[PDB]
Amino acid sequence: HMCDAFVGTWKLVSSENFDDYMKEVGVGFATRKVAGMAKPNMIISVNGDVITIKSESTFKNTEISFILGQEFDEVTADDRKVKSTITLDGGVLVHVQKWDGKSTTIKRKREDDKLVVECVMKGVTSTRVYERA
Ligand SMILES: O=c1cc(O)ccn1Cc1ccc(Cl)cc1
């Protein structure tokens, strides 16, 4: 039952500072424009120890499967090749991406009936709110 509160199909309902987060990460202009327009759904499922997070939008579809605490290689929507580790720390999914000596962290947390995603690069934080589909 690891992560039951996260499992299901979620749809983006609001975003703040995501363009600025992408700038901080190094995402180029045309990718930022199209990625920032997206209204993705996030589909989270668990099978045994394997968690799968799929993100579907008109921009890109991504899918990652992983075991908590076990590093994996990820190709992000913006085409960075990163080394990622996802852990569950005090009920929060914490997703760290490492590439080119840089690091960014994406946190996913349940708050009321929402799933709140906080993306942090250096001093820039973006908050994205998802609701059940
Ligand atoms: O998967 C997600 C979902 C979000 O709501 C926010 C960030 N990311 C990762 C992401 C990173 C870069 C780009 Cl361009 C798009 C999405």
UniProtKB/Swiss-Prot annotation:
Quote the subcellular location field of this record: Cytoplasm; Nucleus
Q: Which positions bind a fatty acid? A: R128, V129, Y130
Annotated motif Nuclear localization signal, positions: 23-33
Q: Which residue ranges run through the membrane?
A: none
Q: Which residues carry this modification: Phosphoserine?
A: S14
Origin organism is Homo sapiens (Human)
Task: Write down which residues bear the modification named N-acetylcysteine.
Answer: C3
Task: State which gene encodes it.
Answer: FABP4
Record note on quaternary structure: Monomer. Homodimer. Interacts with PPARG.
Q: Known CDD domains for this protein? A: FABP4
Q: Which residues in this protein are found as Phosphotyrosine? A: Y21
* Keywords per UniProt: Acetylation, Cytoplasm, Lipid-binding, Nucleus, Phosphoprotein, Transport
Q: What is this protein called?
A: Fatty acid-binding protein, adipocyte
Q: Which GO terms describe its biological process?
A: brown fat cell differentiation; cellular response to lithium ion; cellular response to tumor necrosis factor; cholesterol homeostasis; fatty acid transport; long-chain fatty acid transport; negative regulation of DNA-templated transcription; positive regulation of cold-induced thermogenesis
Hey, which family's this protein in?
Answer: Belongs to the calycin superfamily. Fatty-acid binding protein (FABP) family.
Its domain description in UniProt is:
Forms a beta-barrel structure that accommodates hydrophobic ligands in its interior.
Q: What is its main location?
A: cytoplasm
What Pfam families does this protein map onto? Answer: Lipocalin
Which InterPro entries does the record associate with it? Calycin, Fatty_acid-bd, ILBP, Lipocln_cytosolic_FA-bd_dom
Return one GO MF term.
fatty acid binding
**Purpose of the protein:** Lipid transport protein in adipocytes. Binds both long chain fatty acids and retinoic acid. Delivers long-chain fatty acids and retinoic acid to their cognate receptors in the nucleus.
Gene Ontology cellular-component terms for this entry are: cytoplasm; cytosol; extracellular exosome; lipid droplet; nucleus
